[PDB]
Amino acid sequence: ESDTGLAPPALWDLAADKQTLQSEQPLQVARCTKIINADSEDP
Amino acid sequence: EERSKVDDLRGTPMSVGTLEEIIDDNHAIVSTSVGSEHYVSILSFVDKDLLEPGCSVLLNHKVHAVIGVLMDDTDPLVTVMKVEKAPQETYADIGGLDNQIQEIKESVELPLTHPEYYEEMGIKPPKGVILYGPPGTGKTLLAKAVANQTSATFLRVVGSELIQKYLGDGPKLVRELFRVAEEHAPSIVFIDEIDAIGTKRYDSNSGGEREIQRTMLELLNQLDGFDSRGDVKVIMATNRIETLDPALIRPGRIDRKIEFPLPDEKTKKRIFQIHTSRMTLADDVTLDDLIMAKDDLSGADIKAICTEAGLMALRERRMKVTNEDFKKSKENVLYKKQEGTPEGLYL
Amino acid sequence: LREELQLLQEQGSYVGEVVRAMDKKKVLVKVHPEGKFVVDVDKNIDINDV
């Protein structure tokens, strides 16, 4: 069956109210990459 | 009510993601199916206990946040290779190789059943046992003969259900196998044909060999992590040995190098009897002339005779097999490798 | 001709090969250029479509 992390409701009931909503619009999505080099006095 | 709100809080076209690593600060790094890696946040109803590096989760399209953990039949690739049923005949199937039986009995059954010889003196049991020699010299038949007489679970690895292309599935199933070896009885790790993965220790620059050398190094690491193994026995078998990994032949890891030399016409007569046992052997046939004439044939050849003897009976619409069928199968099947012998020169 | 023209002004549909999936009105569709997707069924079709 599609479980999808059921978590029987005692540990996330307060967390699912609006803390999810503050993780949606303020918290953006980033990506991890690699740095080749840099420059002096100007990044 | 509350279950329907959170099941509708996330987006409906949920995308199948892939975990890479976990940071314990309400976010983590994941990986898409295209390999693009996204530094996303994780929710709090996600049941943060089963989260493992290598599992799959559910992601969003907008922010790609970790919606929920995804099952994967929990491991389809360690439960198939585990033997559940009984193997072949225990000790009477084989013959003539009783020199090596005391080796494998005292190295496996004696550390398990009677671990007091090792405690009266203080001599540790061996871990690695290597089976090499001629190709098809009866290494498959011997490994099933030992694994029948047992009191513990047994593991059977093909050797080709280890290398994938997912960049992490190589070293993953090493821990998956040894956990099954740990959670169950102190089983016998039988990984057959390790020569395709372990040879000559070369490093190249492409992305083709890097999935081999790490998995080779991680298995050598996970075998000898030296923390807690619980007396895991490992049997490794290939045909050849000269193009293999030298640092597994060195002591400290494997101190048993069992060879299987070539048999004689003495061991054949049982193999002729065993292969001509589950058939309609008519009482007008002779097998002893077929043993006396041909001087080089293995268990695969006799089985190839028995099938050809079975085919010739079905051609002329019969049930039993006549003696001329065994003669014509001996003169048709066995004429494929008879080449090269110094006759009439030696005494 | 208007019926053929009104459905013409409409975006294309994907394809997904499904061998098996789960129940509870969510199926498992794997597209060709990308990976798998847990999606939702329609109301014009059934669920027993595995």
Residue B17 assigned to a binding site = no
CA distance B200 to B243: 7
Close Cβ partners of C49 (under 8 Å, ≥ 6 residues apart) = C18, C27, C41
A26: its two tokens: 């303020």
Residue B219 in contact with residue B225, Cβ under 8 Å?
Answer: no
Residue B144 in contact with residue B131, Cβ under 8 Å?
Answer: no
DSSP C1-50: -HHHHHTTSS------B-S---STTEEEEE-SSS-EEEEE--SSS-S---
Close Cβ partners of C37 (under 8 Å, ≥ 6 residues apart) = B13, B14, B15, B16, C16, C28, C29, C30, C31
B176: its two tokens: 């998956």
Residue B172 assigned to a binding site = no
Interface test with A, best of B4, B5, B6 (most A CBs within 10 A): B6
**Strand ranges for chain B from DSSP E:** 14-16, 18-23, 27-31, 38-41, 56-59, 69-70, 128-132, 154-157, 188-192, 233-237, 254-259
Closest CA to B169 of B55, B66, B39: B55
Q: What is the DSSP-derived secondary structure letter of residue B248?
A: G
What backbone phi and psi angles, to 5 degrees, belong to B110? -70, -35
Residue B228 in contact with residue B182, Cβ under 8 Å?
Answer: no
Residue B258 in contact with residue B129, Cβ under 8 Å?
Answer: yes
Name the maximum alpha-carbon separation found in chain C: 41
Residue B268 in contact with residue B296, Cβ under 8 Å?
Answer: no
Determine whether the interchain pair A5/B64 forms a contact, defined as Cβ–Cβ distance below 8 Å: no
3-state SS, residue B29 = strand
Residue B139 assigned to a binding site = yes
Q: Position B345: which residue type?
A: L
Residue C41 in contact with residue C28, Cβ under 8 Å?
Answer: no
Strand pairing of C26-30 and B254-259?
unpaired
Closest CA to C26 of B38, B62, B15, B285: B15
CA distance A35 to A43: 12
Strand pairing of B233-237 and B128-132?
parallel
CA distance B8 to C45: 22
Q: Position B163: which residue type?
A: I
CA distance B16 to A37: 34
**A residues 4-43 closer than 8 Å to B (CB):** 4-7, 9, 11-13, 15-16, 19-20, 23-24, 27-32
CA distance B129 to B126: 8
Exposed, middle or buried, B138 (CB in 10 Å: 0-12/13-18/19+)? buried
CA distance C37 to C40: 10
Q: Which residues of B103-123 are buried (b: 16+ CB within 10 A; e: fewer)?
A: ebeebbbebbeeeeeeeeeee
CA distance C2 to C24: 39
What distance in Å separates residue B174's CA from the closest CA in chain A? 26
Q: What is the DSSP-derived secondary structure letter of residue B42?
A: B
Strand partners, B49: none
What backbone phi and psi angles, to 5 degrees, belong to B310? -75, -30
Q: Which residues of B45-82 are buried (b: 16+ CB within 10 A; e: fewer)?
A: bbbbeebeebebbbbbeebbbbbbbbeeeeeebbeebb
Residue B134 assigned to a binding site = yes
Close Cβ partners of B138 (under 8 Å, ≥ 6 residues apart) = B94, B97, B260, B263, B299
Closest CA to A13 of C36, B100, B5: B5
Q: Is A5 left (phi over 0), alpha (psi -120 to 50) or beta?
A: left
B51: its two tokens: 């989260």
A3: its two tokens: 């479980």
Q: What is the DSSP-derived secondary structure letter of residue B107?
A: H
Residues on chain C bordering chain A, Cβ-to-Cβ distance under 8 angstroms: 22-24, 26, 38
| Calculated CA dihedral for residues B168, B171, B176, B178, nearest 10 degrees | -170
Three-point CA angle B107, B113, B114, nearest 5°: 85
What distance in Å separates residue B11's CA from the closest CA in chain A? 12
Tokens 């039949």 belong to residue: B73
Strand pairing of B38-41 and B188-192?
unpaired
Exposed, middle or buried, B307 (CB in 10 Å: 0-12/13-18/19+)? middle
Q: Position B282: which residue type?
A: A
The partner residue sitting opposite A5, judged by closest CB among B2, B63, B68, is B68
Neighbours of B127 (CB within 10 A): 20
CA distance B171 to B182: 17
What totals of helices (H) and strands (E) does chain B contain, helices first? 10, 11
Residue B256 in contact with residue B130, Cβ under 8 Å?
Answer: yes
Length of chain A equals: 43
CA distance B319 to B313: 7
B191: its two tokens: 């990984």
